[PDB]
Each structure stands twice: as C-alpha cells, then as structure tokens.
C-alpha cells in the first residue's frame, strides 16, 4: 500500500502563513523525489517544484521560485509546501506526487488526495436562503456565504429526482452563492457557520 | 517556454468509439512524455509514461504513441470510466522540468437537446435586505454551449453549469442576475433570452 496522504482543507486570510503536509507510507521515502502540483479552480495542472528528501535538494518551476517554499522532514516521511504570506490568488487544490522510479524525476505515479487552500479576506458567514417560486421547476437561492461548502438537500433527502444543485459562484463581495433547483422546503447546511436553514 | 499543447479541448464521444487525443510539444522531446487522467474532485492518475508504456493496472484499451513533437493517446474502445479529463506532461530526469498540457475533456456524445427555460423573480425576503436576484434556469440541454442574454426593460450576472447528468448526458445552467433595489424597482418586465443550437431562434421567458 504505497500512499501519499495530505493534510486537511485550509481556509485563510491574505498575509497569513500556511504550511501543508504530504506524508509517504509503504515505501522508502528518502529514495524518491516529491513533487508539488497546483490546480486552480476550474483550471489545469501546474508543476510547482520538487524536492529530494534524502538531502532536501530542491528545485522550483521558475514561476513559483521565491513564491513558495518546499521542504521535507525525512525522519517522518513528510514533505511540505509552505507560504509565509498567502495571496488570494494562492486559492487552489494542491497535490503532492511521487515519481514512479527511485532517485528519478520520472512521471508521477503516486498522488496524494489533495489539499484545498482557500485564501480570502472574507470572514465566516452563513448563507441567506431564498425560495425560487413557480412540468414545473423551483428552487432555493443560497446566497452570500463563506466559506465553501454548503450542502443542499430537499425534503430531508426524500426528494432527489429533478434535483440539480449547481456549483457555487464567487461574487465580487468575496461571498459565495449557489442555486439548488428541482416556499416548499429545501434543507441547507453550512457547517463553517453552524448555519442550518430548512426553507 | 517549452509548451505542451493539447487538442481538442473537448472531445464528444460514445461508449465504444476508438478515440485519439493529441499533444504537441513546442520543441522535440523524444519520448519523455506522460499522460494522466483526472475525474472531478479526484487526484490525477498516471496512464502512460515514456510516450507509450502502460502503467500497471491501467486498462489495455489505452495506448500512447509518438516521438519528438507530436504525441497521441488512444482509447481503442471508450468505456463509461473513460469519461474524464486527460493531461499530457513533458518530464526529464536529468534536470527538473515538468510541463503539463492544458487538458482535454472527454465527454458523452448525445443528440441535441434544447434547454427547457425557466425564470424566477426575487423573493419578498431578499427584497427587504438590499438586493434583487433574478435567476434564469437552463435545464437539461446538449450540447454544453449555451448563451444567456439577460434583459432589463453587462457585468451584473454570473453563471454556473452542472456536470454532465450521467444518466441523461445533459447539462443544466444557472444564471444569477444581481442588482440593487432600485435598479430593480425602477424597471418592470423581466426577461431571460437563451441561444442554443437545439433551438431555431433564441427563446425568452
């Protein structure tokens, strides 16, 4: 069982420091490079850089050079991606990955599950839920919340057919909004703010 | 810029098709090329390395070929699992350089379906708090491309698309019209106009 396991989701404000982890298991960690890959939301994969845990030999993609620190603690098989001053634009899924062969910079065959990092100057806020009133359709507008995610069920799980809950859009306010479409009750759960609104 | 370019950006295919996806390198790179798959949410998975070597476990209907500057990934018979996004990647070993292509999304081909269109005015509640949100719903349509035209008797609307409904292969879209109350109370009759090739001419409601 060769794995890379990554630390939990992070929500931060710009300026704050952050250090996320990638832990290897089921193989000799000091023997393989570790890479980091960025994926911005709705975007594709970006190589950020790579480190050799044996001696922390480190290389950066020229665009990320001086913009993020990669390190490793080989005694505990953990690699790290580190920012001393997060930007809004740092908001992304971060993946660690391992080359297929030892002491080599080959294609990545082991990947961690990913660490979502949200950097925003917004603060935790529960959503307002508005009915979308009237084969016919209707829904709820789950407006102005931070951070992701919200869960929207209908009739406490009974009603699932016709149900389309859409990706949140990020408003210029820094707050999220989504619609769930299928007055009569939608159950919206936002756990960051402990908000729970049956509408 | 060593740059890797993929085409098409989107590929519409059916279960059973032989499909081929292209990668081009801005300069010759021998066989130092890998292919990756990614599903929504999931982490990328390695399929091919050295242009044409299959990773263990990866189904044999996958193959890669090419050398120098043009590379291809082929699925001899597309299966429901293969609907996903694919990336290529130049790597070395010698000295660190990884470069991804921008991705190709393989999606289920379907007959053209017009969107059912519905529009919702703001609620009473919202109408007290400071803003109006008119939502236009474009429901169960194909293909993915649709143009939403907000009419008020811009840059004040946002859009969101469902992933392909995998029992139907359709998309659904939501547009949110956000103004204050009164850009809202000044004006009276509202309208959402929708272009999509499943419809002769733009429909409005």
Numbering used by the authors:
A (entry chain H): 1 to 9, 11 to 30, 35 to 59, 62 to 72, 74 to 111, 112A, 112 to 141, 150 to 197, ...
B (entry chain L): 1 to 29, 36 to 57, 65 to 72, 74 to 80, 83 to 110, 113 to 171, 176 to 227
What wording appears in the published article?
Antibodies to the autoantigen transglutaminase 2 (TG2) are a hallmark of celiac disease. We have studied the interaction between TG2 and an anti-TG2 antibody (679-14-E06) derived from a single gut IgA plasma cell of a celiac disease patient. The antibody recognizes one of four identified epitopes targeted by antibodies of plasma cells of the disease lesion. Epitope 1 is a major epitope as 30 of 57 monoclonal antibodies derived from single TG2-reactive plasma cells were found to be epitope 1-specific.
The binding interface was identified by small angle x-ray scattering, ab initio and rigid body modeling using the known crystal structure of TG2 and the crystal structure of the antibody Fab fragment, which was solved at 2.4 Å resolution. The Fab fragment displays a conventional immunoglobulin fold characterized by an anti-parallel β-sheet sandwich architecture with CDR loops forming the presumed antigen binding site. The electron density is well defined for most residues in the CDR loops except for Tyr-109 in the CDR-H3 and Tyr-110 and Ser-113 in the CDR-L3, reflecting the flexibility of the CDR3 loops. Despite intensive effort, co-crystallization trials of the Fab fragment of 679-14-E06 with various forms of TG2 were unsuccessful. Molecular dynamics simulations suggest interactions of 679-14-E06 with the N-terminal domain of TG2 via the CDR2 and CDR3 loops of the heavy chain and the CDR2 loop of the light chain. In addition there were contacts of the framework 3 region of the heavy chain with the catalytic domain of TG2. As to details of the interactions with CDR loops, the model suggests that Glu-8 of TG2 forms a salt bridge with Lys-56 of CDR-L2, that Lys-30 of TG2 forms a salt bridge with Asp-111 of CDR-H3, and that Arg-116 of TG2 forms salt bridges with residues Asp-62 and Asp-64 of CDR-H2. By testing in ELISA, neither of the hybrid antibodies (i.e. 679-14-E06H/679-14-A04L or 679-14-A04H/679-14-E06L) bound TG2 as compared with the efficient binding by the 679-14-E06H/679-14-E06L antibody. This suggests that residues of both the heavy and the light chain of 679-14-E06 are involved in recognition of epitope 1. TG2 residues Arg-116 and His-134 were identified to be critical for binding of 679-14-E06 as well as other epitope 1 antibodies.
